Write a protein that binds this DNA or RNA. Structure first.
Lengths: 109, 107
DNA sequence: CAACTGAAACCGAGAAAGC
DNA sequence: GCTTTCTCGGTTTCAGTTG
């Protein structure tokens, strides 16, 4: 019983993250924005709030104690999805080289 | 992987300007010609950078479109970030006819 | 945006950590 | 076990510069 699976579902269903949307009706495939940050400018990442949310939920960032580190927050979730058996990247559907890019992930039941 | 690979390339002697500058095999000269300039030969001047792109798997002959400028960027940035290589900027001459950088190898 | 650059952001994968 | 994070060694983009 790991924490990432259900947490991530709740974030997509909430609709609080601009580009974090379902791609099918079954709610088993979804898009996650993935844009290369600027030099100390992480607002172009329309889902930067998502990476912060994961460090908050997991306690890896406690506001007022730790120094903000968005680049690291992004690496923690990248490595988390890669090593997860609950998610497989649909590399054929991922779109990294467009004006508003995203990865595509599917949920293994 | 980089430290031993670049040693082997210098030892090999396949690269005309890539030579040792001392007996201890701890300081070496690496050619660094600008691609647009007039005395630039695409074959030998891009050879070492391509060798690195091939060795690591980035470039694949007959499969990928050549991109010499990238190959050069790869190795430049790999030397900067490596703590196995510090540049001796006072010994480097990048603004002459036969330009070169100079690097020391930390053991 | 041709070639080029330093610095920052980025990456996979194995070891380490945590549960 | 069973899942996330840390460490390592380069790699690629960022925001310009001609290094």
């Amino acid at each position: 019983n790991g924490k990432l699976r259900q947490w991530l579902i709740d974030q997509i269903d909430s609709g609080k993250y601009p580009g974090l949307v379902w791609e099918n009706e079954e709610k088993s495939i979804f898009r996650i924005p993935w844009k290369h940050a600027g030099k100390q400018d992480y607002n172009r990442e329309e889902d930067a709030a998502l990476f912060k949310a994961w460090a908050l939920f997991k306690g890896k960032f406690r506001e007022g104690i730790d120094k903000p580190d968005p680049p690291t927050w992004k690496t923690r979730l990248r490595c988390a999805l890669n090593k997860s058996n609950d998610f497989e990247e649909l590399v054929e559907r991922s779109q990294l080289d467009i004006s508003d890019p995203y990865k595509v992930y599917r949920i293994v039941p």
